[PDB]
Amino acid sequence: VYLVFLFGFSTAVVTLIEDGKYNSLYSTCLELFKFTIGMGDLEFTENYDFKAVFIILLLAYVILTYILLLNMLIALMGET
Amino acid sequence: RRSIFDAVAQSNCQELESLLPFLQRSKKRLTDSEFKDPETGKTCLLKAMLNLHNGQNDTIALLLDVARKTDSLKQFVNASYTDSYYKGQTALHIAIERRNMTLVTLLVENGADVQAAANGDFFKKTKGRPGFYFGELPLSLAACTNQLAIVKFLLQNSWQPADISARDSVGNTVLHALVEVADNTVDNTKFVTSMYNEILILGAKLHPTLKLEEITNRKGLTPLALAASSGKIGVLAYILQREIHEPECRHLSRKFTEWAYGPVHSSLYDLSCIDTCEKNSVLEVIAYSSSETPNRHDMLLVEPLNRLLQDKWDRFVKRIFYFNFFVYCLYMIIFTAAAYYRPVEGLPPYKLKNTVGDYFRVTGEILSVSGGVYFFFRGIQYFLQRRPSLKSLFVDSYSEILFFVQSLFMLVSVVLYFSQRKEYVASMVFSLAMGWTNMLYYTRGFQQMGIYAVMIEKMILRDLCRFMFVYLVFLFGFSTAVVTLIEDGKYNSLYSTCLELFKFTIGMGDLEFTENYDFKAVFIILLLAYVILTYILLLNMLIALMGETVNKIAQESKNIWKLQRAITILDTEKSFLKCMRKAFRSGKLLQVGFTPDGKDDYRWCFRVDEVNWTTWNTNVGIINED
Amino acid sequence: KSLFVDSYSEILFFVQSLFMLVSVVLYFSQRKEYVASMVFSLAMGWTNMLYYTRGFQQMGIYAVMIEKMILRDLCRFMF
Amino acid sequence: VNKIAQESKNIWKLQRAITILDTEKSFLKCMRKAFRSGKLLQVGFTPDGKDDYRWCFRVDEVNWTTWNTNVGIINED
Amino acid sequence: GKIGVLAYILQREIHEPECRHLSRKFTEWAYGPVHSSLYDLSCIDTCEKNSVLEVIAYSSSETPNRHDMLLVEPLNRLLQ
Ligand SMILES: CCCCCCCCCCCCC(=O)O[C@@H](COC(=O)CCC)COP(=O)(O)O[C@H]1[C@H](O)[C@@H](O)[C@@H](O)[C@@H](O)[C@@H]1O
Ligand SMILES: CCCCCCCCCCCCC(=O)O[C@@H](COC(=O)CCC)COP(=O)(O)O[C@H]1[C@H](O)[C@@H](O)[C@@H](O)[C@@H](O)[C@@H]1O
Numbered sequence: 015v016y017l018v019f020l021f022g023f024s025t026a027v028v029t030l031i032e033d034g035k036y037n038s039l040y041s042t043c044l045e046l047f048k049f050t051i052g053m054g055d056l057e058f059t060e061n062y063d064f065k066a067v068f069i070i071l072l073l074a075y076v077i078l079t080y081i082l083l084l085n086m087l088i089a090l091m092g093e094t
Numbered sequence: 095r096r097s098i099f100d101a102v103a104q105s106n107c108q109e110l111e112s113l114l115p116f117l118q119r120s121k122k123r124l125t126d127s128e129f130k131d132p133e134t135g136k137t138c139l140l141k142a143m144l145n146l147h148n149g150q151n152d153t154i155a156l157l158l159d160v161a162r163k164t165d166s167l168k169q170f171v172n173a174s175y176t177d178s179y180y181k182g183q184t185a186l187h188i189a190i191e192r193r194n195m196t197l198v199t200l201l202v203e204n205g206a207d208v209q210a211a212a213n214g215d216f217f218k219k220t221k222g223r224p225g226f227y228f229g230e231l232p233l234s235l236a237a238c239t240n241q242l243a244i245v246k247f248l249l250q251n252s253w254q255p256a257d258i259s260a261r262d263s264v265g266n267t268v269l270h271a272l273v274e275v276a277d278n279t280v281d282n283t284k285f286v287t288s289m290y291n292e293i294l295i296l297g298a299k300l301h302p303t304l305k306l307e308e309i310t311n312r313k314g315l316t317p318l319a320l321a322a323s324s325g326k327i328g329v330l331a332y333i334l335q336r337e338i339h340e341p342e343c344r345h346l347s348r349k350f351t352e353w354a355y356g357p358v359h360s361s362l363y364d365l366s367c368i369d370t371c372e373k374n375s376v377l378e379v380i381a382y383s384s385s386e387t388p389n390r391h392d393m394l395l396v397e398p399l400n401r402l403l404q405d406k407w408d409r410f411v412k413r414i415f416y417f418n419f420f421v422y423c424l425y426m427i428i429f430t431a432a433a434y435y436r437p438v439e440g441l442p443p444y445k446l447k448n449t450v451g452d453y454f455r456v457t458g459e460i461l462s463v464s465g466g467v468y469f470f471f472r473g474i475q476y477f478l479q480r481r482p483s484l485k486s487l488f489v490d491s492y493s494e495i496l497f498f499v500q501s502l503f504m505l506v507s508v509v510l511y512f513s514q515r516k517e518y519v520a521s522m523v524f525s526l527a528m529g530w531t532n533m534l535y536y537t538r539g540f541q542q543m544g545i546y547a548v549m550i551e552k553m554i555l556r557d558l559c560r561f562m563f564v565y566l567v568f569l570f571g572f573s574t575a576v577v578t579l580i581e582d583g584k585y586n587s588l589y590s591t592c593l594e595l596f597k598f599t600i601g602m603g604d605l606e607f608t609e610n611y612d613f614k615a616v617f618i619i620l621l622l623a624y625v626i627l628t629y630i631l632l633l634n635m636l637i638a639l640m641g642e643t644v645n646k647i648a649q650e651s652k653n654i655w656k657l658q659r660a661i662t663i664l665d666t667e668k669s670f671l672k673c674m675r676k677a678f679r680s681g682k683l684l685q686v687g688f689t690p691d692g693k694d695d696y697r698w699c700f701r702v703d704e705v706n707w708t709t710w711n712t713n714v715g716i717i718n719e720d
Numbered sequence: 721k722s723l724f725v726d727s728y729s730e731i732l733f734f735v736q737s738l739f740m741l742v743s744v745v746l747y748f749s750q751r752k753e754y755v756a757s758m759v760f761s762l763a764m765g766w767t768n769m770l771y772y773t774r775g776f777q778q779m780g781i782y783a784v785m786i787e788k789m790i791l792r793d794l795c796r797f798m799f
Numbered sequence: 800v801n802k803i804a805q806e807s808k809n810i811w812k813l814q815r816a817i818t819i820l821d822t823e824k825s826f827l828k829c830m831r832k833a834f835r836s837g838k839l840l841q842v843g844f845t846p847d848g849k850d851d852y853r854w855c856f857r858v859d860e861v862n863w864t865t866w867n868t869n870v871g872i873i874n875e876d
Numbered sequence: 877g878k879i880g881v882l883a884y885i886l887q888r889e890i891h892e893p894e895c896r897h898l899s900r901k902f903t904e905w906a907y908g909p910v911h912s913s914l915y916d917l918s919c920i921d922t923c924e925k926n927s928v929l930e931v932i933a934y935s936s937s938e939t940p941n942r943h944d945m946l947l948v949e950p951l952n953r954l955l956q
């Protein structure tokens with residue numbers, strides 16, 4: 015489930031930005047993976063138009079993966 | 095009239111010894127207007143019936159003798175209330191309700207009408223008033239109060255036998271009424287089942303050509319369809335595996351034994367009106383119910399239904415589901431590739447070059463818009479065909495709304511593209527994001543991932559919303575305090591400080607992000623209070639609450655997953671998009687071969703094998719070849 | 721003793737009002753430390769919104785659980 | 800969290816009870832609609848000949864066993 | 877905080893002549909499976925000295941069954 019969410023939001027974010035230093039699927043996947051290990055930036059680039067879209071995408075990703083899925087993994091392991 | 099009511103109320107026949115003398119002298123009868131309550135129509139017979147001791151009241155016989163002498167008994171015994179709250183109630187209803195066999199026998203002997211409908215507001219179905227609904231008829235009243243002797247008498251008496259197929263104002267027969275009074279408790283289920291069985295046997299003996307269970311009420315529901323739609327789990331369980339070991343009425347069974355070796359035997363389940371009826375089948379009623387039915391998720395665990403759904407899945411539906419998953423994966427890969435290679439010049443639409451990459455790109459764009467149009471019309475077809483209510487759009491049908499919203503974002507992107515707006519990009523990425531999360535729809539079809547996805551849903555709807563309300567209140571409060579303290583800074587705005595304080599939640603908070611203030615200690619105290627309240631208390635509490643929740647939703651999650659797969663099976667069976675109609679379940683077998691007349695039954699049975707290592711009894715098989 | 725063990729919400733609303741009045745007194749005394757009072761009142765003013773979670777069953781029970789977590793586990797941990 | 804479920808529900812109910820009593824005491828408009836319901840004739844027979852009224856609260860019940868004839872007050876349902 | 881005695885008193889019903897008036901729970905009417913009961917409410921919400929609701933609600937925090945006493949039968953429905 016985690017890899018599906020990571021790939022989907024990485025494709026959306028890399029499609030939004032344009033021209034330079036993160037206009038690449040590998041780099042954006044790495045940047046969004048850093049949120050999982052407690053090192054995410056939230057301002058790692060400015061090369062876009064539509065700031066609100068960028069922030070909404072990152073906040074949705076953070077809410078879905080970091081606050082919901084990891085704590086749910088802890089709960090499920092405790093059940094197991 | 096007051097003297098008569100006082101005499102019958104006190105059960106003192108000595109006060110009425112002169113009744114027939116002065117009634118004959120005055121040429122008056124007890125059914126005239128002067129002896130009735132003008133407000134309600136109550137008469138002396140009804141007052142005598144209402145009040146009695148140990149089942150005995152001697153004034154009733156005196157009243158019947160006097161009425162017989164004066165004019166007649168037909169107009170006196172069949173008196174009833176004439177108000178709008180007890181309308182139609184008569185002495186026979188009171189005799190049955192009081193559990194008095196003798197009074198019922200005497201009332202029937204003297205010409206009581208055993209088809210009188212008590213249709214007052216008290217006796218009808220309503221919420222914000224007292225009442226008790228039983229089907230308005232004395233046969234239904236006796237059946238619904240667990241009085242077998244009275245229904246036997248009412249059907250089998252010589253003076254006036256009761257009409258077993260009678261219908262009330264709603265159209266309910268006795269069996270509809272018995273379904274209506276069930277409430278899924280143990281004793282209620284026991285007596286309702288027993289009375290249903292007895293009425294079926296008696297109806298078969300008295301009217302061999304009458305099919306009681308095919309009669310429909312005004313809504314077009316048989317008793318089985320009503321039991322399924324209302325959520326009566328016990329009655330449904332009783333009906334679907336009914337077995338009657340009695341000659342002359344074995345055709346009423348729905349479960350049969352085909353053959354038996356020593357430990358092994360094979361059973362047949364009737365399967366009529368379960369999956370094919372052309373009016374309203376059991377599976378359609380359960381699956382497309384309106385989310386307020388009590389036992390919506392539990393009804394599919396009744397014995398034949400789970401097996402026949404698994405049979406449908408294994409036989410032809412699984413391959414179609416996997417094909418749909420494959421096509422959706424191809425669609426999303428093409429959409430991702432097309433969106434990734436968008437041009438970066440200004441002001442769409444963009445002119446195509448005579449080069450290979452542009453042809454592949456525009457082909458991908460055409461396919462993406464095609465898929466968007468497809469899901470748009472699928473959403474409209476869903477809404478028209480199901481006709482859901484306002485509540486059902488929110489408490490149910492999440493996947494339909496998500497796929498429809500994805501298509502709406504795609505179409506708005508097309509409109510903005512051809513209007514020469516760069517904001518079409520802002521639409522497109524949202525659609526792209528939704529397109530990937532909707533991939534989780536296909537986790538049904540695999541048991542472990544489907545149950546996992548149901549658990550994710552319940553976590554979102556229960557724990558995360560409660561967390562986020564309190565969290566957002568605390569975040570906004572401390573953000574307003576901190577931004578008020580700062581003066582003439584870089585930050586000095588609600589958005590920037592909200593973002594900075596949000597960074598503490600994800601393990602990236604600073605604690606020294608600005609110095610543009612006076613009063614350092616106030617700044618530090620506010621930040622430490624925020625960190626203690628949100629980071630150390632609330633997040634760990636969210637983990638603890640999710641751990642509590644996951645321990646309790648195991649079986650509920652499995653039942654919800656099975657209902658989701660059932661809806662998928664029914665939709666695939668209905669659509670099927672290839673003209674194929676090989677959608678019957680099992681063989682058209684002979685069950686008994688002896689209906690009440692000389693004909694033989696074929697009934698589309700479903701086969702289940704069972705093994706038992708105790709109770710080595712002999713069964714009544716159908717065939718001698720195993 | 722019931723002040724310490726009971727009636728928390730009355731104490732919290734009263735302390736909020738005390739910060740407000742001290743802020744007014746500092747304001748008219750030509751002090752900038754009135755700001756230091758005011759923001760504390762503002763912070764408390766938002767957290768006391770949780771008082772109104774009673775009246776809804778799920779949020780009221782959730783708020784009671786927050787109160788018990790603070791009084792039982794957090795104190796021992798912080799010590 | 801596994802232990803404090805029922806205790807939490809009971810404490811919430813007590814909090815709402817305190818709110819209800821404070822609202823009744825304040826009452827905001829000198830209205831008497833806050834008063835309880837149903838000044839009914841209860842038995843109507845004290846040890847003396849007089850009758851009694853008691854401001855009662857009505858509750859409806861259903862029971863599918865022990866079909867006994869209860870000693871009611873009135874014959875109209 | 878004597879919860880058992882309170883539960884006894886509030887739904888007391890005595891079935892014998894010359895002692896019916898001592899009851900606090902009464903049966904108003906009964907059809908076949910349905911019946912309607914009446915509870916007294918005398919000195920539960922209005923007595924001008926010490927009503928049950930005021931005594932329970934404003935108790936001194938050391939009563940043994942402070943939180944459980946409101947679950948006795950008429951009081952929960954009355955508060956709702
Ligand atoms: C910008 C980016 C947006 C991110 C969105 C992230 C969504 C994650 C979810 C992914 C999609 C999964 C899905 O497709 O939806 C799921 C539930 O999704 C949710 O959790 C909603 C979150 C609101 C299926 O629900 P379903 O339609 O099958 O309804 C069931 C009935 O059938 C059944 O009878 C019962 O009524 C039962 O209570 C119902 O569940
Ligand atoms: C910058 C500074 C921030 C301070 C933030 C502090 C936390 C949030 C507080 C939000 C307000 C919530 C509220 O309104 O306060 C909670 C108390 O929360 C705490 O514990 C704070 C500890 C300190 C309600 O307690 P209540 O007054 O309703 O009393 C109940 C009695 O009614 C009942 O009879 C029993 O005696 C029962 O045991 C009692 O609970």
Ligand SMILES: CCCCCCCCCCCCCCCC(=O)O[C@H](COC(=O)CCCCCC)COP(=O)(O)OCCN
Binds near residue numbers: 039040041043047
């Ligand atoms: C839990 C999973 C977390 C995901 C973490 C991010 C990785 C996912 C990448 C998926 C996107 C597709 C990768 C495309 C590879 C590629 O073409 O990118 C290559 C990078 O090579 C590699 O490091 C191979 C990585 C092997 C991946 C081992 C899992 C070169 O790009 P550079 O920027 O480095 O150099 C360019 C200099 N101008």
Ligand SMILES: CCCCCCCCCCCCCCCC(=O)O[C@H](COC(=O)CCCCCC)COP(=O)(O)OCCN
Binds near residue numbers: 073593
């Ligand atoms: C769990 C959620 C945590 C949320 C934390 C962060 C968001 C807090 C927002 C609340 C405060 C109100 C926002 C006011 C918008 C505004 O007026 O500020 C706008 C900002 O526009 C936006 O990005 C809108 C963002 C919409 C996001 C919606 C989720 C411009 O300020 P800038 O500094 O960026 O530009 C100017 C530079 N000279």
Ligand code: NA
Binds near residue numbers: 051052601602
């Ligand atoms: Na970190």
